[PDB]
Amino acid sequence: VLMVGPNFRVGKKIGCGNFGELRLGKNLYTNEYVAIKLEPMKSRAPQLHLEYRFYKQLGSGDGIPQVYYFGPCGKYNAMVLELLGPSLEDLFDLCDRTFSLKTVLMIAIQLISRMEYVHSKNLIYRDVKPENFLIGRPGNKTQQVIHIIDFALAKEYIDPETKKHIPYREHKSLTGTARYMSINTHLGKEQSRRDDLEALGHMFMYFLRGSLPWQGLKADTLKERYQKIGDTKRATPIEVLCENFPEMATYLRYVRRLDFFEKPDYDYLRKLFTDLFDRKGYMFDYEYDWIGKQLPTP
Numbered sequence: 001v002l003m004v005g006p007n008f009r010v011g012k013k014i015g016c017g018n019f020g021e022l023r024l025g026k027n028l029y030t031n032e033y034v035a036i037k038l039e040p041m042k043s044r045a046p047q048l049h050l051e052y053r054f055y056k057q058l059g060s061g062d063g064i065p066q067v068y069y070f071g072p073c074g075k076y077n078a079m080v081l082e083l084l085g086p087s088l089e090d091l092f093d094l095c096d097r098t099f100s101l102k103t104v105l106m107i108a109i110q111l112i113s114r115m116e117y118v119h120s121k122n123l124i125y126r127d128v129k130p131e132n133f134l135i136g137r138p139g140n141k142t143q144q145v146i147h148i149i150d151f152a153l154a155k156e157y158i159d160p161e162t163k164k165h166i167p168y169r170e171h172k173s174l175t176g177t178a179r180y181m182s183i184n185t186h187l188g189k190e191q192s193r194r195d196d197l198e199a200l201g202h203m204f205m206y207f208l209r210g211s212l213p214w215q216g217l218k219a220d221t222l223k224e225r226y227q228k229i230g231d232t233k234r235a236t237p238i239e240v241l242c243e244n245f246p247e248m249a250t251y252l253r254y255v256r257r258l259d260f261f262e263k264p265d266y267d268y269l270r271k272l273f274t275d276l277f278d279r280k281g282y283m284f285d286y287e288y289d290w291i292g293k294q295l296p297t298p
């Protein structure tokens, strides 16, 4: 009998995490399923209200989920947003944890554009991981579109007061997933646009290889674990990380060498991948590896 706002019925748990809970919802007024992200009001470290402001700042973008509502819901703050499909991580599992180059390239082309969009709205994303990239709903007009989701860790990298790029600094506690995060993120540096692009590169390599060569590093503290992973990242030449994928190596070398304040050349990066895509005789037809598989649905 729980409701969010005038018209959103809260249904079954379709997920949870440190963030709180994901529920299937229904807009009763429109007969449409929605996703309802719930954060306990009692939360130390609220991030749902921030995230809602980020989405409003992103506005309606290609591959940006629509957000319908922010408001209270029993002992939770609730954000009603577009019900999307499976994550790239869930899809990766469906596809035996390797994607074809065609798939990774279709993903990468889209995601460079997504990131560029986020960046054009003066946001850095700072939580690149396969779990935060969702296809649209099986059957929907956007099932083929890779969406970017979860802006809880985002930040305005252009200060709205000054309209200047945020300053460089270090001693930043680490933001994002260890596996994909930029080398500079490991070093406690302020993240900027480069770091989102580098994280994507890492994730692309994950998709292509099946794994990254710094997965499963154990340490006694989370700080030591992050440190070892970043050490391994620094110790692993792009040449061997991206062996057999010359354009990924080029992408990764480029993003890693970006200056803190530097506007990435997204056109260049897209073209590395679109020129590759074309040389391989791939057709951008959204025939991803997971097409014709039974996709999980709430």
Ligand SMILES: Nc1nc(Nc2ccc(S(N)(=O)=O)cc2)nn1C(=S)Nc1c(F)cccc1F
Pocket: 014, 015, 019, 021, 022, 035, 037, 065, 081, 082, 083, 084, 085, 086, 087, 090, 131, 132, 133, 134, 149, 150, 296, 297, 298
């Ligand atoms: N907006 C949205 N739609 C969906 N769709 C979804 C969720 C679960 C499943 S399931 N239950 O694995 O089949 C399928 C599609 N998930 N979703 C969100 S916001 N997922 C999500 C996320 F992608 C990252 C962090 C927290 C979350 F709640």
